[PDB]
Amino acid sequence: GLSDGEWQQVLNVWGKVEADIAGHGQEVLIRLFTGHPETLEKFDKFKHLKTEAEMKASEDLKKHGTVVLTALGGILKKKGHHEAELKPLAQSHATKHKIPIKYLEFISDAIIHVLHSKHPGDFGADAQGAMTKALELFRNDIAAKYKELGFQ
Ligand code: MNR
């Protein structure tokens, strides 16, 4: 797991996200979609987005980004004690949305990139280590539920 020190770093970094949840959410999803266009195909509500301009101009994409990061922030504030929060997400993503664990890897990487991009020189080596661990824990606990369901 993460240490107390590490959790404190994670939630300190998260303060940056909470100051502009929509901006961060948008950039995360744009980073995902542009870097991995197959991921866009998982969203019937975003498949019409043919260009990054169109993505950037989509109010609904920003709305979804807020939903995404709000759910993730809920999970993070539980400091690993997130069974109740993570289980239904694991299950809707495997059973309904059909999201391979690789895509969760993609978005984890996207969050790290976006933090650097929006906060260059203000997301230190310790911060990245702690946030990376938190995102890995999240991914790994989802992966456990995916295996349970035989998904992917
Ligand atoms: C590649 C695509 C996918 C990735 C990566 C991904 C990653 C993540 C992620 C990682 C940080 C979090 C947190 C996250 C959280 C959510 N997510 Mn998700 N998600 N996610 C979808 C695709 C993906 N998610 C789709 C498709 C829907 C339904 C969208 C709609 O039509 O309204 C959805 C829906 C949702 C919803 C709405 C409730 C539900 O349906 O369970 C939340 C919350």
From Swiss-Prot:
* Gene3D superfamilies, sorted: 6.10.140.2100, 6.10.140.2110
**One GO biological process from the UniProt record?**
oxygen transport
Family, according to the entry, reads as follows: Belongs to the globin family.
Q: What positions does the domain Globin occupy?
A: 1-147
GO MF terms listed in the record are: heme binding; metal ion binding; nitrite reductase activity; oxygen binding; oxygen carrier activity; peroxidase activity
Q: Which residues bind heme b?
A: 93
User: Gene symbol?
Assistant: MB
Query: Which keywords has UniProt assigned to this entry?
Result: Cytoplasm, Heme, Iron, Metal-binding, Muscle protein, Oxidoreductase, Oxygen transport, Phosphoprotein, Transport
What residues bear Phosphoserine in this entry?
3
Q: How does it assemble?
A: Monomeric.
| Residues that hold O2 according to the record | 64
Top enzyme class: oxidoreductase
Which residues does the record give as nitrite binding sites? Answer: 64
| Subcellular location field | Cytoplasm, Sarcoplasm
Q: What does this protein do?
A: Monomeric heme protein which primary function is to store oxygen and facilitate its diffusion within muscle tissues. Reversibly binds oxygen through a pentacoordinated heme iron and enables its timely and efficient release as needed during periods of heightened demand. Depending on the oxidative conditions of tissues and cells, and in addition to its ability to bind oxygen, it also has a nitrite reductase activity whereby it regulates the production of bioactive nitric oxide.
Catalyzed chemical reaction(s) = Fe(III)-heme b-[protein] + nitric oxide + H2O = Fe(II)-heme b-[protein] + nitrite + 2 H(+); H2O2 + AH2 = A + 2 H2O
Stored PROSITE patterns: GLOBIN
* Pfam hit, one: Globin
Q: Listed GO cellular component terms? A: sarcoplasm
UniProt protein name: Myoglobin
Species annotation:
Equus caballus
Provide the E.C. number(s) assigned to this enzyme. 1.7.-.-, 1.11.1.-
